[PDB]
Amino acid sequence: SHMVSLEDAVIARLESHGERFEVLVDPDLAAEFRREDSDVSVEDVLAVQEVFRDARKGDKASEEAMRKVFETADPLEVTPVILRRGTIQLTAEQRRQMIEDKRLKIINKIAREAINPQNGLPHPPKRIEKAMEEARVHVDPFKTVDEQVNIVLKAIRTKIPIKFEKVRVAIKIPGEMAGSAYGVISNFGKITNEEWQNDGSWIAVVEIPGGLQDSFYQKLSELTGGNVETRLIK
């Protein structure tokens, strides 16, 4: 059962005519809540169901002040307005930790999904990282990894040849390993076709994120102790 630690909670703040209203929120869930068509409930976003004047100092808002500003004193009705119209306040440590966390996740997600369209091959994480530096990418502490991946990809595509692309790999493995390979495959992609062979081996066509071509081969080879054949489809 999930909860934001009080250490990890951030503040969402809304000011009206010089008066602050603040709530303590899970930063990941708060970011999701801000997205279009999110299924995250406000109850899951809030660390406590209380509206503060100052959330770090613990001074809380009057019901009268909330009614004046929001036309409601219900924290579950006030909070969505603060989240959608307000700002996010981070401590120095939180900003540093969040940027670092998201930076690594962005590098990995790009490395996983991307290929070099010139040769069809993956870019190692280190290459993506180097491109981000060249493009002087600033990672945001708060924006979701999903949103930032697209921003960052656009920024680095002038530095390196890069595109998100799924690829299809045909694999051939001994029949004894087919059950086991299904489990490995499910970490990497989706089986689009599979056929037991006349000779007892098993062939599967697997659609994977293009940046995983080498990792996929490595895991399959380790599983089958080298008893695997792979090729890119066509």
Numbering used by the authors: -1 to 232
Give me lines lifted from the publication on this model.
The Methanothermobacter thermautotrophicus mth685 gene, which encodes the homologue of the Shwachman-Bodian-Diamond syndrome (SBDS) protein, is located in the predicted exosome superoperon.
We obtained crystals of the full-length mthSBDS protein (residues 1–232) belonging to the P2221 space group. Indeed, the high overall r.m.s.d. between the two molecules is due to nearly pure rotations about the hinge regions that can be defined in the boundaries between these domains. In the crystal, molecule B makes extensive interactions with its copy related by crystallographic symmetry. However, sedimentation equilibrium data for the mthSBDS protein showed the presence of only the monomeric form in solution (data not shown). Thus, we conclude that the biological unit of mthSBDS protein is a monomer.
